[PDB]
């Protein structure tokens, strides 16, 4: 439909790997699998592999996976699409699911091209014996996906990656390797893993002082992977509010201390394995 | 009208805090845009009805003037729609000619449908059109004194699209007022009508219970009338007492044993 002809926004644009930290081995666990078929496919035929098809992520949210989901675009130069696992459903049955056939074919007509898919727990149920009058609809919507990646319809030269914040509840029939041949967990990293992420913001904006991290980051055993971009701007957010438009390591402290407890009052909800 | 910033009470705490989040969208690009750091492109926020959020919204435009045209999602609900969804996307380059004018959308998204599934009907064209009008836009620190935005009923129910929460997440629950506040609000809504001053709202200020801001406007507009319901040019001020309970009328019918 034209809606498939709308999602594709930034199919190429490179935001490379230097702008990331903490994940120097997951990407070593992932630059391995994806690019190689799409760089040097005869190796798996040099050696005799049924090549992979499917990957995902897991770990708590606001952590940097979606960046990785696009950071590979920079390496390839090749194509990409972004899409959720939510804005699919509608009233008319099948119309939600027909789209799935509309799109994998749409991959085949122009590639190297791959797929992303958020929040798949919505399409991530265990097929129940009993049900409501309608919740089985997504289950029949699901299994098309369960089919098309490994169905009777053979496939090659396209890839899917998905992600959740709730690995459980999933139909194991999805988790059959062949439908996705490697997993990974992205955690909240260690302090140093939390430290490159801290400085990349300073790497862009006008720094003024010396390092002054190791004790600042002593507080950094609580944060997520994404509250710090807020923290980074939040320092200059009110370093300037005194009309002092040349930032300091004096003012972030009031910020970085502040965020922790306003984050505390509705934080640490769950972790999902 | 060009009513003041406040018009609401003594809530300097929020507003004098708030627009500090809008100075950079308003101005300060000298080192901000030389720092290039994040810029909330429309401080969308929340708080259920009852508040003067429209007033806090509009009164902030007292400094950043804005023509009186502010049309909402119920304009975006018609037959074979999309020309309305055309309208919204053109809405800002339209205004981007020369204006710190900024309109104020209003969203009760699933106030027509159910929410038994969290996977929800994040409305068709708003969820689409809101992106381009937000992704590809700057303010230039002049003639864009604020950034167009909206607000909603309850921050639990939304399908956050790309950059729906990426940058534009500046948001506060307006803390409902207290007795030191309240009595000076209803003062405002009697600035046009005077009465017997024998009992101040400060006398009332302990008598209030579970009163949000909007419905308090339904106090003196009647209790000013409940006086002249008995045609006293000298407005009495105990008509509040038997009118405040007219919010729901109490079904007061001949209390038997009480």
């Amino acid at each position: 439909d034209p809606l498939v002809y709308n999602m594709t926004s930034f199919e190429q644009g490179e935001i490379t790997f230097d702008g990331i930290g903490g994940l120097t081995e997951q990407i070593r666990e992932l630059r391995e699998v994806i690019e190689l078929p799409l760089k040097n496919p005869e190796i798996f035929q040099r050696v005799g592999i049924k090549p992979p098809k499917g990957v995902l992520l897991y770990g708590p949210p606001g952590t940097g996976k979606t960046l990785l989901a696009k950071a590979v675009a920079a390496t390839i130069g090749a194509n990409f699409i972004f899409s959720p696992a939510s804005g699919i459903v509608d009233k008319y049955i099948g119309e939600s699911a027909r789209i799935i056939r509309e799109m994998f074919a749409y991959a085949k007509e122009h590639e190297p091209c791959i797929i992303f898919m958020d929040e798949v727990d919505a399409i991530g149920g265990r097929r129940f014996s009993e049900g409501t009058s309608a919740d089985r609809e997504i289950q029949r919507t699901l299994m098309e996906l369960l089919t098309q990646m490994d169905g009777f319809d053979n496939l090659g030269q396209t890839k899917i990656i998905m992600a959740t914040n709730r690995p459980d509840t999933l139909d194991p029939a999805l988790l059959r390797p062949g439908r996705l041949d490697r997993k990974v967990e992205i955690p909240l990293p260690n302090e140093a893993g939390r430290l490159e992420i801290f400085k990349i913001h300073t790497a862009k904006v006008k720094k003024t002082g010396e390092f002054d991290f190791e004790a600042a980051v002593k507080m950094s055993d609580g944060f997520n992977g994404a509250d710090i971009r807020n923290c980074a701007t939040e320092a200059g957010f009110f370093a300037i509010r005194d009309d002092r438009d040349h930032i300091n390591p004096d003012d972030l402290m009031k910020a970085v201390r502040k965020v922790a407890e306003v984050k505390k009052l509705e934080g640490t909800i769950e972790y999902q394995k | 009208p060009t009513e003041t910033y406040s018009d609401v009470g003594g809530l300097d705490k929020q507003i004098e805090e708030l627009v500090e989040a809008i100075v950079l969208p308003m101005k300060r690009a000298d080192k901000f845009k030389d720092m290039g750091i994040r810029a909330p492109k429309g401080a969308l926020m929340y708080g259920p009805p009852g508040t003067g959020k429209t007033l806090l919204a509009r009164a902030c435009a007292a400094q950043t003037n804005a023509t009186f045209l502010k049309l909402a999602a119920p304009q975006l609900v018609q037959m074979y729609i999309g020309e309305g969804a055309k309208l919204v996307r053109d809405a800002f380059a339209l205004a981007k000619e020369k204006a710190p004018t900024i309109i104020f959308i209003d969203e009760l998204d699933a106030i027509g449908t159910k929410r038994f599934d969290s996977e929800k009907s994040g409305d068709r064209e708003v969820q689409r059109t809101m992106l381009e009008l937000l992704n590809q836009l700057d303010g230039f620190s002049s003639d864009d004194r604020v950034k167009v935005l909206a607000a909603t009923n309850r921050v639990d129910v939304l399908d956050p699209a790309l950059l729906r929460s990426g940058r534009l997440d500046r948001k506060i629950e307006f803390p409902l007022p207290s007795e030191d506040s309240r009595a000076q609000i209803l003062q405002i809504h009697s600035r046009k009508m005077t009465t017997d001053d024998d009992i101040n709202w400060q006398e009332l200020a302990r008598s209030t219970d579970e009163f949000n801001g909007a419905q308090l406007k339904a106090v003196t507009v009647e209790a000013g009338m409940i006086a002249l319901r008995n045609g006293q040019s000298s407005v009495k001020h105990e008509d509040f007492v038997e009118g405040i309970s007219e919010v729901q009328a109490r079904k007061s019918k001949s209390v038997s044993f009480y």
């Binding site: 009233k91 008319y92 049955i93 009058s133 309608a134 | 599934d117």
Partner: peptide
């Protein structure tokens, strides 16, 4: 027209 009514949908 060149059509009439006919439809189906879920409820929840």
């Amino acid at each position: 027209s060149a059509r009439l009514g006919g439809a189906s949908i879920a409820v929840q």
